[model samples]
Target: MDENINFKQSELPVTCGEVKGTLYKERFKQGTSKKCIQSEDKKWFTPREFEIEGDRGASKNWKLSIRCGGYTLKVLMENKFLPEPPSTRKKVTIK
Candidate 1:
């Protein structure tokens, strides 16, 4: 089974612990503008940063898993950072 999923919304409202905010398709920050929640206190760890850790192999598969706009959002929505989930999510593997 592919377990692959499709999403429609560009972002989804999430409640990671006591924090509540929106997650976007990609990182956005210009001057003061941003795509993450106004505060990191409520933001999920960036997938981009997570992909950079280790041998870059974990990052490689991490990229493939999130290649689809919707899947990325699903995984993000399905989990959160720290008190919720790992900021650097594990690469997608055969399930």
Candidate 2:
């Protein structure tokens, strides 16, 4: 829980041009700073925005999924805060 402070909570240079949204940095009071994306419509969004479906007492599982572009942001940050190229590789293969 205390590990959150190590991360820089500054606004990341990430954007979803297709959706006209930009990633913003925000933090909770006495809590870790987190990544959130906002749009031109004056709305703020975060990863795993949706609530868990069904079974209120099912092991208290929450924040387990990445619904928005949160996962994309994770990858973007790894590459010097820049988004990956738009062109898709043709020779890529996986087992």
lDDT of 1 at 44: 46
Candidate of highest TM-score: 2
Residue 8 in candidate 1 has what lDDT? 34
**Clashes per model (N, Cα, C within 3 A):** 0, 0
lDDT of 2 by residue, 1-95 (tens): 11222234454333332343444544321111343545565765443221222112242322322222343333333332332344234453321
Model 1 stretches with alpha carbons more than 4 Å out: 1-6, 28-35, 39-95
Residue clash pairs of candidate 1? none
Model 1 TM-score, 2 decimals: 0.27
User: Each candidate: what lDDT?
Assistant: 0.35, 0.33
Q: What lDDT would candidate 2 get against the real structure? A: 0.33
Prediction 2 TM-score vs. true: 0.32
Measured against the true structure, the TM-scores of the candidates, in listed sequence, are: 0.27, 0.32
**Which residue pairs in model 2 clash with each other?**
none
lDDT, model 1, position 40:
50
